[PDB]
From a paper:
CmTic110C, composed of residues 871–1218, contains the corresponding region from the middle of TM5 to the C terminus. The crystal structure of CmTic110C was determined by selenium single-wavelength anomalous dispersion (Se-SAD) at a resolution of 4.2 Å. Our structure covers residues 903–1213, missing the first 32 and the last five residues of the CmTic110C construct. The structure comprises 14 α-helices of seven continuous anti-parallel helix-loop-helix pairs, forming an elongated shape of about 96 × 28 × 15 Å. Due to the low resolution, CmTic110C is assigned as a poly-Ala structure, except for the six Met residues. The region corresponding to TM6 consists of helix 3 and part of the loop connecting helix 4 in our structure (colored in yellow). This region is 28.2 Å high, much smaller than the 60–80 Å thickness observed for the chloroplast inner envelope membrane. Therefore, this helix is unlikely to cross the inner membrane. In the crystal packing, CmTic110C formed an extended superstructure with tail-to-tail and head-to-head packing. Therefore, the shape and structure of the Tic110 C-terminal region most likely also enable Tic110 to function as a scaffold for interacting with other proteins in the chloroplast translocon complex.
Author numbering: 903 to 931, 934 to 972, 978 to 1045, 1051 to 1067, 1077 to 1094, 1103 to 1159, 1179 to 1218
Write the structure that this text describes.
């Protein structure tokens, strides 16, 4: 039966490749017929010795003889034999290492230029992990824009800005615009109003929270005034007004006024 069939397999009757085969199966777990070809095939894609080169592909033949074109399937094969070991060199270790291992990979395979037809297909989405869930960080969400250009070269503007906001605030002005321009290197360059509606609803919390009880809203000012009750907080502007006047340096002179012109411009 499938019992005299496997007993026909008693024909192929390898121990090695046979065992290894079924072994590669029952284990990994399945068309008794299927893996049969499978394992064999990649076993052939191996190193030659004129007669093994023969028995193998020769029985590899008696195989198609079994199944008995569909042989495009021997392409769905290496396909993953690639994709796997492929994206294997995924997480940035591109090198001459990839270069190296890779080729040789497609070597013990068929694969015409199709290589690329995946080389990136992989490298491609290879990013779709990171820059997709760029949230779980922002320096990475940017790290995408870092390398997610290196290889591959919609609220995509949201993080773009958020990662631009958090990064910019923590973080010259116009060449850093080039850092926010790294964002225009992902999103449009006209979404400053999703930037402003994104950098405006931030200043507040500092106003609301710094402004609450004992000593200062001078801090929530220094950093929130790092942008570009009513007179009460205009006193933090008064507070540093003198507190800042901690040197009366040439600049201290100009940064104190316009700034105090901002809390003053952002009057109330």
């Amino acid at each position: 039966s499938n019992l005299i069939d496997f007993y026909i397999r008693n024909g192929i009757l390898e121990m090695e490749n046979e065992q290894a085969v079924y072994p590669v199966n029952l284990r990994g777990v399945l068309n008794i017929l299927q893996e049969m070809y499978r394992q064999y095939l990649i076993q052939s894609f191996a190193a030659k010795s004129r007669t093994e080169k023969e028995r193998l592909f020769n029985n590899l033949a008696h195989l198609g003889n079994i199944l008995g074109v569909n042989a495009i399937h021997s392409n769905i094969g290496s396909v993953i034999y690639k994709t796997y070991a492929s994206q294997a060199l995924t997480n940035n270790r591109l090198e001459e290492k990839d270069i190296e291992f890779l080729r040789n990979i497609q070597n013990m395979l068929s694969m015409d230029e199709a290589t690329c037809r995946t080389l990136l297909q992989e490298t491609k989405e290879a990013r779709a992990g990171f820059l997709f869930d760029k949230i779980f960080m922002a320096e990475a969400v940017a790290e995408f824009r870092r390398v997610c250009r290196e290889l591959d070269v919609e609220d995509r503007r949201v993080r773009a800005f958020r990662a631009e906001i958090e990064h910019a605030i923590e973080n010259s002005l116009l060449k850093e615009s080039q850092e926010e321009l790294g964002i225009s290197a992902e999103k449009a360059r006209q979404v400053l109003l999703d930037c402003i509606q994104d950098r405006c609803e931030a200043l507040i919390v500092q106003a609301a929270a710094s402004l609450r009880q004992r000593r200062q809203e001078g801090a929530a000012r220094d950093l929130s005034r790092a942008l570009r009750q009513e007179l009460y907080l205009v006193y933090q502007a008064y507070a540093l007004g003198t507190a800042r006047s901690n040197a009366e340096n040439d600049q201290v002179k100009e940064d104190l006024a316009l700034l105090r012109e901002m809390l003053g411009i952002q009057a109330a």
